Write an enzyme that holds these catalytic residues in place. Sequence first.
Site, PDB file in Angstrom:
ATOM      1  N   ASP A  17      37.164  44.179  40.952  1.00  0.00           N
ATOM      2  CA  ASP A  17      36.603  43.693  42.210  1.00  0.00           C
ATOM      3  C   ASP A  17      35.076  43.691  42.296  1.00  0.00           C
ATOM      4  OD1 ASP A  17      38.813  42.811  43.516  1.00  0.00           O
ATOM      5  OD2 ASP A  17      39.188  44.665  44.646  1.00  0.00           O
ATOM      6  N   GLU A 113      43.345  44.293  41.536  1.00  0.00           N
ATOM      7  CA  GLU A 113      43.807  42.969  41.127  1.00  0.00           C
ATOM      8  C   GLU A 113      45.326  42.907  41.041  1.00  0.00           C
ATOM      9  OE1 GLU A 113      40.910  40.626  40.194  1.00  0.00           O
ATOM     10  OE2 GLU A 113      40.776  41.198  38.087  1.00  0.00           O
TER      11      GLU A 113
HETATM   12 MN   LIG Z   1      41.058  42.928  45.259  1.00  0.00          MN
END
Ligand SMILES: [Mn+2]
Length: 175
Positions: A17, A113
């Site tokens: 991220d 993710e």
């Molecule tokens: Mn994320």
Amino acid sequence: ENVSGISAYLLGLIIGDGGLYKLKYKGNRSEYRVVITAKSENLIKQHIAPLMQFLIDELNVKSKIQIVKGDTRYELRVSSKKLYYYFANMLERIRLFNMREQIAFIKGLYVAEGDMTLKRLRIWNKNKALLEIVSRWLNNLGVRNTIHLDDHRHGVYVLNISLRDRIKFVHTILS
DNA sequence: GCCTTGCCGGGTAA
DNA sequence: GTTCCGGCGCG
DNA sequence: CGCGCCGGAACTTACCCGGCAAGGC
Ligand SMILES: [Mn+2]
Ligand SMILES: [Cl-]
């Protein structure tokens, strides 16, 4: 060690991220950035930042944790040559993570993710080779999984964790 | 049935 | 997620 | 003169989500 684990976790967040940036400005100025971005300022302030602060204290890094409000997300940013090379060198030695680090890192990558719905267990990334690394760690932890190219629009691969092993995964890795 | 997982488009959170 | 910008500090 | 920490801000796109349907017990 306690720091290697927190380190592995933060690297998952970072890869997932945020990023590591070696910036060059005019004239011959520079900067090194360790970044995690997120939608929620609260997650960043309450969950992520205290972890990074610990690491900063532990390494006697001098830079401050910056929390910057972007148009679409908040950004945690540490402006630090030292912190940058620390994470960057760690990324290069990723294949050698031990179990403790493997787990912490997969945890971070999944939080960043992964399919946090948890209905399916999935991890997305354009880096196949990174997924192949994670895949092997998982297989060796007894968690079957596959990789294929999920999104043909953006070359995004998905690492799919067999629901036959959902329990061992949720329990072992997301602890 | 039902569960699993490859497929693929939406659009926001990276 | 990534890289511009103008600022500042410092040997 | 050369570099490295701040504080943004503009810029781009990689994810996550979630419905569908094919194959398997
Ligand atoms: Mn994320
Ligand atoms: Cl890699």
